[PDB]
Amino acid sequence: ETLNPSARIMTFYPTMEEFRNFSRYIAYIESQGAHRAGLAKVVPPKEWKPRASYDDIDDLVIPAPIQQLVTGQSGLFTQYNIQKKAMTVREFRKIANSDKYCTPRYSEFEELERKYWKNLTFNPPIYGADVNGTLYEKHVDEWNIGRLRTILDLVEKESGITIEGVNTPYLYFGMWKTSFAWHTEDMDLYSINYLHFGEPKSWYSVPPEHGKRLERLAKGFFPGSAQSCEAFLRHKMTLISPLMLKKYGIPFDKVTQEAGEFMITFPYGYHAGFNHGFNCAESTNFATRRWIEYGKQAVLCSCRKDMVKISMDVFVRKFQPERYKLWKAGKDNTVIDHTLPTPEAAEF
Ligand SMILES: [Zn+2]
């Protein structure tokens, strides 16, 4: 309870030598208490770059664009994704920077934040989301989202199971007013998120130690949905105003992400936000030893066919062999302490 008592979003500025060991820097920042906020920003060394130039990607194909339709009032909204026909980045850029769709003029980001919550049901934008891809170029060995070096890919090394987006990279091409809803990442994993180029991306975060209180509110407000799925927030369809969070006493923080910066979301950290204008972000999940407990306790999407669901079996068997017989019995009643850092942080 001592490291980051306010539970605010922190920012770290690793040195090139510190930057090179990914898993070890995550253990670092968690020792500093970054995980309590549920979200952290990491700025890479000025020397570092993931790709020489972004000039040559305008023929990149966005196969399944989404038009984001939003109904709702008083701070609470539901977001419907209409899929439109594929288009190339160029076609997207042009659409994004057109005046129908360009960022409104503004001074301070607070005003841009109010414009978002004021006009999010008007003029449904298009989000080139969930594009299978990397923009890293092959040789970049530090923080390559394509190959981050984590215990996560025991999923597909030892069990041979490709979960596209979870342990393969995703691209996001956004424009002004495009949202991602309140959501923890699948299986309550960590996620990483680099913004390659373009306008900023603004994030909201609820501390994992107060996540259950966010869940209670949403159940109250969408009773119909709560009835249908254990974890209806996993549908990534539900948007809640910061005004509503303040009103009902759910703690949270805001942070804006600039081009060239990394965001880390932590297990059972709820997040949401919006893009300021045309940009491109790259994202994948990943894990540490601390995630293993969250993995096990993860409530999942009952609604569906397709829930990303990961066999916990292989992880417990390797890193928790002294509880595997107990767990398999279903009598593993370990209680999670959201403030505790991952064990890898013992050294720091
Ligand atoms: Zn659901």
UniProtKB/Swiss-Prot annotation:
Disulphide bond pairs: none
Effect of substituting residue 133 to A: Abolishes histone demethylase activity
Positions contributing to Fe cation binding: 183, 185, 271
Lineage: Eukaryota, Metazoa, Chordata, Craniata, Vertebrata
Cellular compartment(s): Nucleus
Tissue specificity: Ubiquitous.
Family (UniProt): Belongs to the JHDM3 histone demethylase family.
Protein name: Lysine-specific demethylase 4A
Predominant cellular place of this UniProt entry's protein: nucleus
Residues at which 2-oxoglutarate binds: 127, 193, 201, 236
Post-translational modification comment from the UniProt entry: Ubiquitinated by RNF8 and RNF168 following DNA damage, leading to its degradation. Degradation promotes accessibility of H4K20me2 mark for DNA repair protein TP53BP1, which is then recruited. Also ubiquitinated by the SCF(FBXO22) complex; leading to proteasomal degradation.
Organism per entry: Homo sapiens (Human)
Ranges for domain JmjN: 9-51
MF (Gene Ontology): histone demethylase activity; histone H3K36 demethylase activity; histone H3K36me2/H3K36me3 demethylase activity; histone H3K9 demethylase activity; histone H3K9me2/H3K9me3 demethylase activity; histone H4K20me2 reader activity; ubiquitin protein ligase binding; zinc ion binding
Record's GO cellular component terms: chromatin; cytosol; fibrillar center; nucleoplasm; nucleus; pericentric heterochromatin
GO terms under biological process: cardiac muscle hypertrophy in response to stress; chromatin remodeling; negative regulation of autophagy; negative regulation of DNA-templated transcription; negative regulation of gene expression; regulation of gene expression
Residues of the full protein shown: 6 to 353 of 1064
Subunit structure, interactors included: Interacts with histone deacetylase proteins HDAC1, HDAC2 and HDAC3. Interacts with RB and NCOR1. Interacts with VRK1. Interacts with FBXO22; this interaction promotes KDM4A ubiquitination. (Microbial infection) Interacts with HTLV-1 Tax protein.
Record keyword Iron-sulfur present: no
Entry remark concerning the domains of this protein: The 2 Tudor domains recognize and bind methylated histone H3 'Lys-4' residue (H3K4me). Double Tudor domain has an interdigitated structure and the unusual fold is required for its ability to bind methylated histone tails. Trimethylated H3 'Lys-4' (H3K4me3) is bound in a cage of 3 aromatic residues, 2 of which are from the Tudor domain 2, while the binding specificity is determined by side-chain interactions involving residues from the Tudor domain 1. The Tudor domains are also able to bind trimethylated histone H3 'Lys-9' (H3K9me3), di- and trimethylated H4 'Lys-20' (H4K20me2 and H4K20me3).
